[PDB]
Amino acid sequence: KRVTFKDVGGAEEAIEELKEVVEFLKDPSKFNRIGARMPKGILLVGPPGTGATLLARAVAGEANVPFFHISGSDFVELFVGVGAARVRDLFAQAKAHAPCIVFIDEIDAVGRHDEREQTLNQLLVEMDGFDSKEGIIVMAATNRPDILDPALLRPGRFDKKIVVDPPDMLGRKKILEIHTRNKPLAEDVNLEIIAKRTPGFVGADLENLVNEAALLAAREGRDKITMKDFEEAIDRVIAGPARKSLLISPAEKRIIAYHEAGHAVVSTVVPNGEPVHRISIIPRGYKALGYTLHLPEEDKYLVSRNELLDKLTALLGGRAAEEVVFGDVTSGAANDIERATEIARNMVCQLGMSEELGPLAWGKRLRNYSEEVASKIDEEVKKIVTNCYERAKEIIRKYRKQLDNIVEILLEKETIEGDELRRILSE
Amino acid sequence: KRVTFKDVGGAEEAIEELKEVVEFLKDPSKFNRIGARMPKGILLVGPPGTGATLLARAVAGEANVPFFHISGSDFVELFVGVGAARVRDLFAQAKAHAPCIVFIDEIDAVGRHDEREQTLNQLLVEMDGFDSKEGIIVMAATNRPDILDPALLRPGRFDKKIVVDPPDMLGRKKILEIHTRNKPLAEDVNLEIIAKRTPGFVGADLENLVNEAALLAAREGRDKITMKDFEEAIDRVIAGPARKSLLISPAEKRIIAYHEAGHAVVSTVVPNGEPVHRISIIPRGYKALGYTLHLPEEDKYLVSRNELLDKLTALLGGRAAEEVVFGDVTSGAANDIERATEIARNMVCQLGMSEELGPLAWGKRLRNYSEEVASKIDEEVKKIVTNCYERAKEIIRKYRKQLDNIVEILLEKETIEGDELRRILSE
């Protein structure tokens, strides 16, 4: 089926770069005429499923030009001479159908110590063989850009790369819409929230998510995939399934509840938190007794000192709540404490966010500073973490009653949504 | 013989995940119809004997569907071409009997540099060969998940893993019951206590335990396996046989007695101990002159500061008793002291359990803190260990008489049960 850029999501940078290619394909003369020479080989780099093959097709379809799809894993295991013969044929079929695009999927499988030499070299000859002015352009995709023989990277061949960057929230939204074209979605499904909740997800991750939501609905023999299926599909993909197996005693469930309710309260009360999306007391995957999902609302590229101080306080909210409520803190907060200490070090040692130490990068060449500076760093780190801690305990003391309500609900229902949470904290 | 999930123990998480598979097998259409695609290859990961083959069979038997058991060690040593031919045959027999399950035991023996290439690749073709909608699903087991060729792990093949986690106490209980189906057990046999006493044990460990108890009863030509056989089988499996060979002088036997009675008293007296199950003065395995078994009663996932302080005191009980009773401490407590120092460091450096040092993770990047902080850590570590020590010596001084009774009994009988121990400490 024909494909254009409207069928690829979240790769705007790469598509803009590829827009010139489309033009060169559409009308080679416009370049040839003034000596603007095109690359003979373009290499798209990124993890599998980022649509690096879809993009190729999208570039041909966007200039209404032939597209010859080939795989670099097909040439592995071929008979002596067969691997080289296939390549010679492909390009012969390209020159005739030119202008066109010649794609080579999983190229790092061929461009990598025997017959693989003949096929690779044969490629190197075909590259050196065709005329770029003919409007012919070879592409290739590879999440394995280092395994490639440096010969293919030499001027005249694959001497250009177009970077295929991971999608932002809006790019993830479009990728979901696309993977959702032929799926029965319930009306309660909000792809914007699912996109918000999958930062770091690429196209192939997003496609798997959609499948996981379908496996979830199919499991219950249902005909529409629902917001529940998506939200649960995200949680499973990230933090594994839901270990409703293990037996947690009532006392430990209280501590877990308080701990989690602690994060959520402090996170909400504090000025710069990302809003809480959900609190769960349900164990998930490899040792994760509870957690608090946030729902971002941004796409921010800078972070401020106050925002990190607020995030630090929230990270200490769990333990603060334990201390204040039970007196006897548990090992549960170890990861919180390590995450918090790590932020403070970074503020003090890289971001120039302590007044004592100044706008200096201490560290990096590894530790390269005196013992006197080392103790000032620790002192500053301790003092930041400690203040955010007291500040968390004060939020706990002040919202004790609503904190109590929140763990009471959580112990009964195991989950509470952020709206309900904001509602309980507003008197 | 037919098998279901009722015949596999302690793998509830994995079985819940596998419940979808069962359904997909039962009625493929329910998925196919809305595009919920299944994995073609599922990989179960875990140590040998965790019933990863039993589970496969359990998934087929739970959907009343054919099961083709194959071994990956059978294809090693095969003639040129034979290894690939076997694979082609297996799947041919699967498509016809579909829906079904195709299992491949010890897959890491084939999916790992000659004929093993043909057989492996032939597998990679058969995978890419069958239709998932047909209701066909390939599984495989491997405690060696890293030795596997990354090709098998690529989407379209073994691109899913279901984690087979080690059983809790209740899971161990069921595994024992199952391995105890066809064994003559005395009435005095309590599988719950044996399950409690084998934390960390997996299915194959539990099966060996049961055998070891049988070897113990057979040795005395008896017809019923007794609680004695089980308890002794545990002690042998963990700490080796009982070295009733070596000759320990009366004076050293006293110190050993006091030392052990020390642990047990302090452990019992202190609020958070796990209850003592048994004290033995009988040497066992590689340099272990005495020891105190505890019988847990929980399945706890959090540990508190007070619980670690109590455990620390108990760990110092042995040496406390030596100091108080003899004046001249021995090298015996070296491992106790190292274990205790290790807990204190961890409380102070990871768990945020000292007030001076705050809820900071010091360490981890290795030591990355000033000399000033290093001395505060040591000072806090020393002060924790020292207080738990004085506290242990005070428990020794206060229960001196019952401590005396306990070593007197121990020197005569060499073993005392926890009930008797609790009885002697209650006036």
Ligand SMILES: CC(C)C[C@H](CC(=O)NO)C(=O)N[C@@H](Cc1ccc2ccccc2c1)C(=O)N[C@@H](C)C(N)=O
């Ligand atoms: C309320 C808390 C438990 C919630 C906490 C996560 C949290 O901050 N949510 O807000 C959590 O789930 N921790 C886990 C995992 C873990 C990882 C490393 C550790 C290192 C040292 C000590 C304990 C550690 C525990 C745990 O404790 N897991 C238990 C099962 C364990 N590992 O035994």
Ligand SMILES: CC(C)C[C@H](CC(=O)NO)C(=O)N[C@@H](Cc1ccc2ccccc2c1)C(=O)N[C@@H](C)C(N)=O
């Ligand atoms: C009453 C105690 C003896 C009981 C103690 C265990 C205990 O805490 N039970 O509560 C014990 O059995 N220790 C063993 C093994 C060991 C291991 C490492 C050592 C390092 C330094 C010094 C002595 C070490 C001894 C021993 O001492 N074994 C003797 C045979 C040895 N190794 O010569």
Ligand SMILES: [Zn+2]
């Ligand atoms: Zn936490």
Ligand SMILES: [Zn+2]
């Ligand atoms: Zn000891």
